[PDB]
Design a binder for this molecule. Structure first.
Ligand code: 3H3
Ligand code: ANM
Ligand code: MET
Ligand code: K
Ligand code: K
Ligand code: K
Ligand code: K
Ligand code: K
Ligand code: K
Ligand code: K
Ligand code: K
Ligand code: K
Ligand code: K
Ligand code: K
Ligand code: K
Ligand code: K
Ligand code: K
Ligand code: MG
Ligand code: MG
Ligand code: MG
Ligand code: MG
Ligand code: MG
Ligand code: MG
Ligand code: MG
Ligand code: MG
Ligand code: MG
Ligand code: MG
Ligand code: MG
Ligand code: MG
Ligand code: MG
Ligand code: MG
Ligand code: MG
Ligand code: MG
Ligand code: MG
Ligand code: MG
Ligand code: MG
Ligand code: MG
Ligand code: MG
Ligand code: MG
Ligand code: MG
Ligand code: MG
Ligand code: MG
Ligand code: MG
Ligand code: MG
Ligand code: MG
Ligand code: MG
Ligand code: MG
Ligand code: MG
Ligand code: MG
Ligand code: MG
Ligand code: MG
Ligand code: MG
Ligand code: MG
Ligand code: MG
Ligand code: MG
Ligand code: MG
Ligand code: MG
Ligand code: MG
Ligand code: MG
Ligand code: MG
Ligand code: MG
Ligand code: MG
Ligand code: MG
Ligand code: MG
Ligand code: MG
Ligand code: MG
Ligand code: MG
Ligand code: MG
Ligand code: MG
Ligand code: MG
Ligand code: MG
Ligand code: MG
Ligand code: MG
Ligand code: MG
Ligand code: MG
Ligand code: MG
Ligand code: MG
Ligand code: MG
Ligand code: MG
Ligand code: MG
Ligand code: MG
Ligand code: MG
Ligand code: MG
Ligand code: MG
Ligand code: MG
Ligand code: MG
Ligand code: MG
Ligand code: MG
Ligand code: MG
Ligand code: MG
Ligand code: MG
Ligand code: MG
Ligand code: MG
Ligand code: MG
Ligand code: MG
Ligand code: MG
Ligand code: MG
Ligand code: MG
Ligand code: MG
Ligand code: MG
Ligand code: MG
Ligand code: ZN
Lengths: 205, 143, 105, 159
RNA sequence: GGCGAAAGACUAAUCGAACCAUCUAGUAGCUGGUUCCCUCCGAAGUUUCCCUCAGGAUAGCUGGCGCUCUCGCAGACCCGAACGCAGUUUUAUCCGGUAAAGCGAAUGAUUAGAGGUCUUGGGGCCGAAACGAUCUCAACCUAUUCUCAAACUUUAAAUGGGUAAGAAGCCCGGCUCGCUGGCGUGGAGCCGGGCGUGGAAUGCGAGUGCCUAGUGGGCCACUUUUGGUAAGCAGAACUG
RNA sequence: AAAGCAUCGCGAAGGCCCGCGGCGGGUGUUGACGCGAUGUGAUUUCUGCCCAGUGCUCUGAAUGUCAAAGUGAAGAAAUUCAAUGAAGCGCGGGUAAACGGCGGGAGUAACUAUGACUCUCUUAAGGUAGCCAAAUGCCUCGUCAUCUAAUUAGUGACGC
RNA sequence: UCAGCGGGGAAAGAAGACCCUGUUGAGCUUGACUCUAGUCUGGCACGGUGAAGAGACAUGAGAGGUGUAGAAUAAGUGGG
RNA sequence: UUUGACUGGGGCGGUACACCUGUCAAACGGUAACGCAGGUGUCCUAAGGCGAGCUCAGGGAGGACAGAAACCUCCCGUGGAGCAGAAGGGCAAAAGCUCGCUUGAUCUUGAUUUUCAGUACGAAUACAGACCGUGAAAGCGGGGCCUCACGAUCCUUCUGACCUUUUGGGUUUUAAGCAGGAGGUGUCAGAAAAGUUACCACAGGGAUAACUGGCUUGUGGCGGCCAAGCGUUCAUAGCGACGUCGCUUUUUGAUCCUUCGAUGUCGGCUCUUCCUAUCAUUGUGAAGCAGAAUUCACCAAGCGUUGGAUUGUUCACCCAC
RNA sequence: GUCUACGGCCAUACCACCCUGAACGCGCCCGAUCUCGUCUGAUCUCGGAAGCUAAGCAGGGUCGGGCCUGGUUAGUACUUGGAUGGGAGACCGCCUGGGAAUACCGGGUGCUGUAGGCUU
RNA sequence: CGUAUGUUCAA
RNA sequence: CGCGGGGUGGAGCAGCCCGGUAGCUCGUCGGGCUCAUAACCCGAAGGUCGUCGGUUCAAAUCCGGCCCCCGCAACCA
């Protein structure tokens, strides 16, 4: 089976991604990174909550899967099966190796792929949930449960941005009225006041 | 006429059940390979027997795994047959030349070749030349 | 490797480029009266067994081809040995390569 | 153990800069090199002939021989615990004039010229360079404006 | 050699080759030892080659011996009247592709939704004799979006590496050349003259030869760093 | 070791062996019911298949190899070159109580299972008569029975 | 200090027999390398007296078909 | 008489033994492991040399048979092609392609670079002197666009001079020289080389394994955290999936620090003491605890934990108390 | 003001689409006898001068793409040297010096050498 | 030279 | 976790090696012969060459991954 996660907690090796030099990597435990209502329009889910790592460590693909399931399950219970959208912001790209010791020694010890981990930085966001403002308490509580599936310390931070966009919530509505933020599915498109005037014409037509 | 010797040097343990080897001054093809490490802790030896490339005579040898063994050089090519005279088959080259040297095989193979020629169909024989001698040992037909 | 049977190259005795007849050098027959052989026979005489090494660990699967270039000038039949790189296959005056022709299977 | 390859590790060193590939601009060949001047060695991968070895790239030497396409350069090379003056031949594509020597040669002319005017005028012109001296005293006018008060900002968790 | 109903048994306490003397002080890259005092200097476990890896040769590190020079003074008293270099900075100039960053920049990897929809396929419906109409899902394109790279990169540090900071310089006149050449052209060399504000800081006296022992098992720490779950583990860089 | 069994060599100018040497010496004051060399191991009952390999042996008409001496040819000669061709080897036969060796896959019977049967690859021969988890079986403390309250033991059976 | 005792002295006895290293051996084996006693075989000598035979090699002839077609392609092989 | 070396002990294995690319490698250069991803012992009369013309991969549109795919045409096309091979670099009126002519892959003396001891070999750079190729010419070219593709002494063999010597002189053969190639040492600075030893020997080695101790704790053992779920209902009486944090040295590994002028090896037997992660027994708390029985947890090691069949057994398994 | 020929730097010069272009030029353009070369006088070579700036080309345009440059990012990331600093660690803070890169926001859109020409 | 076989009962 | 040998019509097996075109036997199917079956005779059909990539003008074949099925080795304490 798997070694305990304590054996691969620290970013001890250079990144070792699945590439043409690293063949036979088993598929990561986590495959679905986005769940809930991914289609919900930018304006439907303004409130955003992030789980932020406070250590420079490795999070295994299995750990990412368990937290995703744990957060999803609770959010369905508290807000509904379509009252939010969860995105896992870490993709396990670092391949960890195992030198199988089956009853020779350390001769030729370079191991074989065992799994994948996501090298996380202090302050890198681990997972994000966007929902309505009235569900802030649940998003903290849901993210609180998912914290117990990870090693190390994590912090829950309610973002001042609007939804999953990179624009402040307190000014998001103003930019949309002034056509500097066109709703484009999940996110928005920023309209730079540059480029051919035809594009400005269509927007204001 | 390249200086490359017909003798080709190669190890013994890196020889398979298909490889060509020269045993007792005779080109041979390996038909069995079994290694063996005698002594509690000594060098493993490899026992290998090769059946000749031309003759059917098997040949046996014992060599330390590490030791090296000569590998023969084979010039193989197949040409269509046009005419049989005095036991000397007449052959045709891709270059366009005709040499009526060599000889039909001295067994059931050779007799079976000539009766095909007498009937007349898609015929072309291979020319195997190792060391200094030659043997025509194979038959082929077009489609 | 294909090398032509003739080439125009420098002739040392003529002091100028001349046509040369190109053959392949082959080792001559040992004289048996060469100093080294006369010593070898004298050393091997009598008892003692083999007195000189017998090389066995051969490794080269090719040889360097030496071309015997002969000046075609009738008054200067000078010969010079010119070596080329190692090659498994070598022929003099082979049919030249052509482009854009069918493989012919 | 690494290989002894002559161009090992020069993947980026002898590569051309981004969007600088192609024909070698011809002012490179129009430069004049004479015995005694100081040249910077910088191998260029476009020209594979007359390459300097990788140990001489980034080194500066003195020209001692000039040929049709190349120059002989004396370059200092540190070999373990000794420095050897190595004489290397490189095509002029891989060298350029050291601007440091050109700047110094200009200053020698300027010093020699300035000395002649110091004799026909008494005045003593400073020739030797001086390290940056401590700043001399001065006044700082507030111009009525009171200096702005700076305070450290409160911590904000930006995630 | 013997002898062995065979155990390599027995052959004078000796046997898988007796005993005695000699060759013979046999050879040993291996173990052990290697004898008074004080004084001064003082290492190496690294490079390359070796049937080399418990050893050598080789360079390095060491010592000894020098030699070649530089630097003296106002004074019996008291009393003034630089040759060059550098485990360092500065100034100038060149070198680099690590850290970081980037992926709405190439290469490779990778999540989501949106809009188009030419073509391409599927589902399905009208039509249903025929095309045909129409909708969907994909593929495909476009603009965005999540996340990454030792063996990717437009960018790109810090530390770092080279060189220069004059008298072997500069300036002026002349001459030689078989090289070069439209041209006393170009280049180089040679000869004569003139010019000291010795052309950054700081420190220091330098240069040069011979002979040469020991060493060539290393180990540790900061920081960087490879393999390993890890190790008082194995392997590197840097300085101590 | 042994009796018993089998095999091998030898008719003396010999077999086997000794010996530095003397056609010296042992067997041998011997002669095939003998001497010498091996294997197996009383009796009882049997001793299957394989001569492809490796030995050994037989054969030598003849081809292929094959030394010295000799013979020829050229040359001033040294020398070179050719022809000739001993044994041996190669070629052919015999021999396993010489050394030794002795197979896979697939289908198939009217419940199921199995497989007398059949197909196919393949060897020099494909392990026969027997015997067995054996002093010989990993799996294994095999499965069944017996022996015991309880048996990794014993015994009997079974045998890809 | 006495009688005991066997925890410790990593107790004594012996320059570890295992294992590894040495460009250190020895006993034995063999398709290892290089030799050798013996043995087989050929040649020269000791080695003589007779008799009857054979082969190769070189020189010249004048011959050497045959199922077939021609009526002897002796057998080929060229210039024809 | 020999039966290589390296080596997380040795053997098996591999070749990290001679080389090349990218990385490691910490932005000069150098830099290790049986580090990672690969390649080499070749190939080429052109795939060498020059010149000339040309533009590639791919895509769009169109054109009888013709279609996904035959050939023709236009358009876009920074190289997304090709350049022998591994990779990296380089290259677009070219280094690619096609064509033409050729033999600079020739002869010769030095200098230099790379590895470096700054020796050799190999390979390479820039010149010089001949003789040539090509192009109108400038010019380019003494092999392959660059980074690998290879080999001493001795010996043999070949090539060169109206060459030197061949011994008292002369002629001739022969032999020996001088210079340049080749034949090869891949353990690639280059011995000529099979096993076994449990019958063994010597010098040594804790530079080095097998047992004990130490570090480590993957593995083994034990415990916790969250809570999807199990539990007629009910996450948490008793359980705990996905994850995740630990402890122990009672297993095995990993390592090789101590011991090879020696620390007696397994198991049992006997005997003492100790630990608690408590089976029982004393005191208790909880239950899906009516009673009885049972389960969970706390204080707790004071005391006890047995008799046998098989097995050398530790371990198992069964009989019985 | 600008062109031609030969250029140096090699996008501030490229790319798309557009508007304008006097003069001279550069072009397109006409033709194949000669030179020369092609399946094809399209290309290439040659001999010209009826027409045209349609194109090339040149100048300009475009809340244009690209490129160049500046700001922001940010004294952030990273980093030299130091501590018997913190923290179980992972890592972090400070002292001493150095100091980036996107997104995002401005500005620019060839300069110039030699020779010859044209613009009352 | 060389081939085998023919489901049960039933006049 | 090692080393080797193989996967090819319904069955067994060639071809590989030694790149240009999948074959042998049996079976299956159809027609004879026979009263009928087999035997025998005349014909026919049948394979993604385990799968995925790469090289090549061209892959069952050469090279490299994955799956499957079988053997060999695992020694000294
Ligand atoms: C390997 C050999 C040639 C080498 C080029 C060479 O130089 C060898 C060299 O002379 C060895 C000497 C050198 C040393 O200085 N003194 C020693 O005495 C021996 C030969 O290769 C073969 O031809 C046969 C090779 C087949 C194998 C059998 C024999 C080799 C024979 C040839 C002697
Ligand atoms: C495999 O089991 C074992 C292996 C070795 C030893 C002896 C060694 N143990 C420690 C010492 O080094 C040595 O003691 C002596 C007296 O020689 C014992 C058991
Ligand atoms: C290992 O077996 C060792 N202790 C004994 C060797 S017996 C010769
Ligand atoms: K390396
Ligand atoms: K490497
Ligand atoms: K990218
Ligand atoms: K030394
Ligand atoms: K006798
Ligand atoms: K046999
Ligand atoms: K036989
Ligand atoms: K003999
Ligand atoms: K020329
Ligand atoms: K060696
Ligand atoms: K553990
Ligand atoms: K010991
Ligand atoms: K125009
Ligand atoms: K009935
Ligand atoms: Mg690591
Ligand atoms: Mg946590
Ligand atoms: Mg003799
Ligand atoms: Mg070149
Ligand atoms: Mg007795
Ligand atoms: Mg014995
Ligand atoms: Mg005695
Ligand atoms: Mg002594
Ligand atoms: Mg030693
Ligand atoms: Mg050597
Ligand atoms: Mg060693
Ligand atoms: Mg020692
Ligand atoms: Mg690098
Ligand atoms: Mg980085
Ligand atoms: Mg960046
Ligand atoms: Mg010394
Ligand atoms: Mg020394
Ligand atoms: Mg030492
Ligand atoms: Mg060392
Ligand atoms: Mg250590
Ligand atoms: Mg260490
Ligand atoms: Mg160590
Ligand atoms: Mg009997
Ligand atoms: Mg017998
Ligand atoms: Mg028998
Ligand atoms: Mg039989
Ligand atoms: Mg004979
Ligand atoms: Mg028989
Ligand atoms: Mg049935
Ligand atoms: Mg049987
Ligand atoms: Mg049995
Ligand atoms: Mg039993
Ligand atoms: Mg038994
Ligand atoms: Mg039993
Ligand atoms: Mg009993
Ligand atoms: Mg029994
Ligand atoms: Mg005691
Ligand atoms: Mg004692
Ligand atoms: Mg000892
Ligand atoms: Mg001893
Ligand atoms: Mg031993
Ligand atoms: Mg040694
Ligand atoms: Mg010996
Ligand atoms: Mg002995
Ligand atoms: Mg032998
Ligand atoms: Mg060793
Ligand atoms: Mg070397
Ligand atoms: Mg580097
Ligand atoms: Mg560095
Ligand atoms: Mg570097
Ligand atoms: Mg390339
Ligand atoms: Mg060209
Ligand atoms: Mg090399
Ligand atoms: Mg020249
Ligand atoms: Mg060239
Ligand atoms: Mg000689
Ligand atoms: Mg003489
Ligand atoms: Mg040589
Ligand atoms: Mg060597
Ligand atoms: Mg021995
Ligand atoms: Mg024994
Ligand atoms: Mg130790
Ligand atoms: Mg030691
Ligand atoms: Mg103990
Ligand atoms: Mg231990
Ligand atoms: Mg622990
Ligand atoms: Mg565990
Ligand atoms: Mg769990
Ligand atoms: Mg130990
Ligand atoms: Mg003791
Ligand atoms: Mg001791
Ligand atoms: Mg003791
Ligand atoms: Mg007991
Ligand atoms: Mg307790
Ligand atoms: Mg107690
Ligand atoms: Mg018992
Ligand atoms: Mg025209
Ligand atoms: Mg116009
Ligand atoms: Mg713009
Ligand atoms: Mg900027
Ligand atoms: Mg029947
Ligand atoms: Mg019937
Ligand atoms: Mg009937
Ligand atoms: Mg009836
Ligand atoms: Zn000549």
């Amino acid at each position: 089976g798997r070694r305990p996660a304590r054996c691969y907690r620290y970013c001890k090796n250079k990144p070792y991604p699945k590439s043409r030099f690293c063949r036979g990597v088993p598929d990561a435990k986590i495959r679905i990174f986005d769940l809930g209502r991914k289609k919900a329009k930018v304006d439907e889910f303004p409130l955003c909550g992030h789980m932020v790592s406070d250590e420079y460590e490795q999070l295994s693909s299995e750990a990412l899967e368990a937290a995703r399931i744990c957060a999803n399950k609770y959010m369905v219970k508290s807000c509904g099966k379509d009252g939010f959208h969860i995105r896992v912001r870490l993709h396990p790209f670092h391949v960890i190796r195992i030198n199988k010791m089956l009853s020779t020694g350390m001769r030729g010890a370079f191991g074989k792929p065992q799994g994948t981990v996501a090298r996380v930085h202090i302050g890198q966001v681990i997972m994000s949930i966007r929902t309505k403002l009235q569900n802030k308490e649940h998003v903290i509580e849901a993210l609180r449960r998912a914290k117990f599936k990870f090693p190390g310390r994590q912090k829950i931070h309610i973002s001042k941005k609007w939804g999953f966009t990179k624009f402040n919530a307190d000014e998001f509505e103003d930019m949309v009225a002034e056509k500097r933020l066109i709703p484009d599915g999940c996110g928005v498109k920023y309209i730079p006041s540059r480029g051919p005037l035809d594009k400005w014409r269509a927007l204001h037509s | 006429d390249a200086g490359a010797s017909a003798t080709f040097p190669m190890q013994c343990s890196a020889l398979r059940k298909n490889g060509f080897v020269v045993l007792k001054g005779r080109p041979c093809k390996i038909v069995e390979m079994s290694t063996s490490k005698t002594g509690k802790h000594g060098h493993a030896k490899v026992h290998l027997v090769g059946i000749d490339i031309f003759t059917g005579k098997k040949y046996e040898d014992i060599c330390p795994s590490t030791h090296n063994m000569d590998v023969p050089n084979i010039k193989r090519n197949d040409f269509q047959l046009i005419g049989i005279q005095d036991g000397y088959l007449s052959l045709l080259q891709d270059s366009g030349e005709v040499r009526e040297d060599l000889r039909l095989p001295e067994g059931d193979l050779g007799k079976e070749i000539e009766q095909k020629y007498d009937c007349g169909e898609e015929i072309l024989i291979t020319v195997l030349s190792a060391m200094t001698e030659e043997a025509a040992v194979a038959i082929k037909a077009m489609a | 490797v294909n090398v032509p049977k003739t080439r125009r190259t420098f002739c040392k005795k003529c002091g100028k480029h001349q046509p040369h007849k190109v053959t392949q050098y082959k080792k001559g027959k040992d004289s048996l009266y060469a100093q080294g052989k006369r010593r070898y026979d004298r050393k091997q005489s009598g008892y003692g067994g083999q007195t000189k090494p017998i090389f066995r660990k051969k490794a080269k699967t090719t040889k360097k081809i030496v071309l015997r270039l002969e000046c075609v000038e009738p008054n200067c039949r000078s010969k010079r040995m010119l070596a080329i790189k190692r090659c498994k296959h070598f022929e003099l005056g082979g049919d030249k390569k052509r482009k854009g022709q069918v493989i012919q299977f | 153990t690494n290989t002894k390859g002559k161009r090992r590790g020069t993947r980026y060193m002898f590569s051309r800069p981004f969007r600088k590939h192609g024909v070698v601009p011809l002012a490179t060949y129009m430069r004049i090199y004479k015995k005694g001047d100081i040249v910077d060695i910088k191998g260029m991968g476009t020209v594979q002939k007359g390459m300097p070895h990788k140990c001489y790239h980034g080194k500066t030497g003195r020209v001692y021989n000039v040929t049709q396409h190349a120059v002989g350069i004396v370059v200092n090379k540190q070999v373990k615990g000794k420095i050897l003056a190595k004489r290397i031949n490189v095509r002029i594509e891989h060298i350029k004039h050291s601007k440091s020597r050109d700047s110094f040669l200009k200053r020698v002319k300027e010093n020699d010229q300035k000395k002649k005017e110091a004799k026909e005028k008494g005045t003593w012109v400073q020739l030797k360079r001086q390290p940056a001296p401590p700043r001399e005293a001065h006044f700082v006018r507030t111009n009525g404006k009171e200096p702005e008060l700076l305070e450290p900002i409160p911590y904000e968790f930006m995630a």
